[PDB]
Structure formats: C-alpha cells, structure tokens
C-alpha cells in the first residue's frame, strides 16, 4: 500500500525562535500541549481526524451497469465506535475505528501497542487523534519508568525569604514570579 493522501500533506514550516529575537504578530494564548504530528491533520475525509481510520480514506469511483452507463459512487470504510482497554492509561478509550484497524489492534495485542509501534507506516496511519493518544501513552510509560528521583520544598523554603529580601529593598514579589525566575536554576 501507499500513504499518498497522508504524506502529500504539507504544513507551514515554523521558524526556530531564539530567546532574543522579536515576537511574531499573533502569538497564541494557551501553549502547545502535544507534539507536532509530522503529517498535519487531514483536509479531505475530516470524519477520520476524530478516529483511528488506519489511513483508509473515502474512495470515489463509478457505479457501472450492464449498459456500462457510468454513475459516480463513493466507497466508505467500515467504521465502528469501539471502547478498547488501555493498560498504560488504566482506562478504556472509545473511538471510531475501521474494522481493519480493530483487527490490527487485536493482532498486535493491545491498543497502546498499536499506538506505540515505531514504524513510519503506523505513524502515517495514526490520525492527529491517534498521534495524541500515542503521546499520552508514551509519556505515561516514561513517567512509570522514571519518577523524578531514582527541590520543590527547597524552593518553598527559600521563597518567603526571597520575598522578604525584595521588600527590604522596596519591591513586592509573588510566587508565580518566583517560580518563573527559578525554573532553570
């Protein structure tokens, strides 16, 4: 097979922003939660952006009679709503799937496994939703593997002292600001 309707897609190349450079005119309010999906978000069978369609877009072709009188028809995939169990998330995740995709999931032995397969083909035939799911699972796995220590209290201890010092000079200081200051330190 091929992933033509996926890998054809192109997204505007964001310029790498240095810390000292000037701002863009429209900077967003809330930050980027998820990583950027290489292949954007489908602009044709937008039905499939909400689910795990397995790179199965709608076809259009011809109904043909005994007289060979051609008439345009479309061929939809066998989509199905299906709440499937994630071991990593410890909850079942309900989404639209192609019956094919459900079969693949069953073969691979789980939904998390299906999401996390490292092949490029899989990545292509994950949606934007599928990509987000993968990210959620992978991040959770990483957390499970590696808890922070294998600092917050120190910051909390120092904060009031820092505030007092600021006041003694003359200025007031708030927590959030303190946190912002001492993130990289």
């Amino acid at each position: 097979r091929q992933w033509r309707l996926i890998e054809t897609r192109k997204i505007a190349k964001q310029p790498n922003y240095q810390v000292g450079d000037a701002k863009p005119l429209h900077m967003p309010k809330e930050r980027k939660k998820f990583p950027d999906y290489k292949y954007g978000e489908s602009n044709i069978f937008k039905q499939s952006n909400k689910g795990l369609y397995g790179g199965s877009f709608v076809q259009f072709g011809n109904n043909i009679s005994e007289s060979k009188a051609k008439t345009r028809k479309k061929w939809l995939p066998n989509v199905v709503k299906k709440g499937l169990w994630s071991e990593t998330l410890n909850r079942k995740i309900s989404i639209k799937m192609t019956a094919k995709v459900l079969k693949t999931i069953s073969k691979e032995g789980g939904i998390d496994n299906y999401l996390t397969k490292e092949k490029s083909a899989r990545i292509k035939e994950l949606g934007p939703t599928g990509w987000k799911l993968r990210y959620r699972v992978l991040k959770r796995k990483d957390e499970i593997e590696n808890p922070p220590h294998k600092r917050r209290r120190l910051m909390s201890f120092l904060y009031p002292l820092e505030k007092l010092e600021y006041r003694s000079v003359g200025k007031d200081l708030n927590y959030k600001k303190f946190v912002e200051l001492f993130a990289d330190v």
């Binding site: 939660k33 990583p35 993968r134």
Partner: peptide, 10 residues
C-alpha cells in the same frame, strides 16, 4: 514539546 523515544528507537 518533543515526543519521547519508544523502546525500539532507544
């Protein structure tokens, strides 16, 4: 944020 590397990738 950058996506983490899966086991095979690592």
């Amino acid at each position: 944020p950058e996506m983490p590397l899966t086991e095979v990738r690592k």
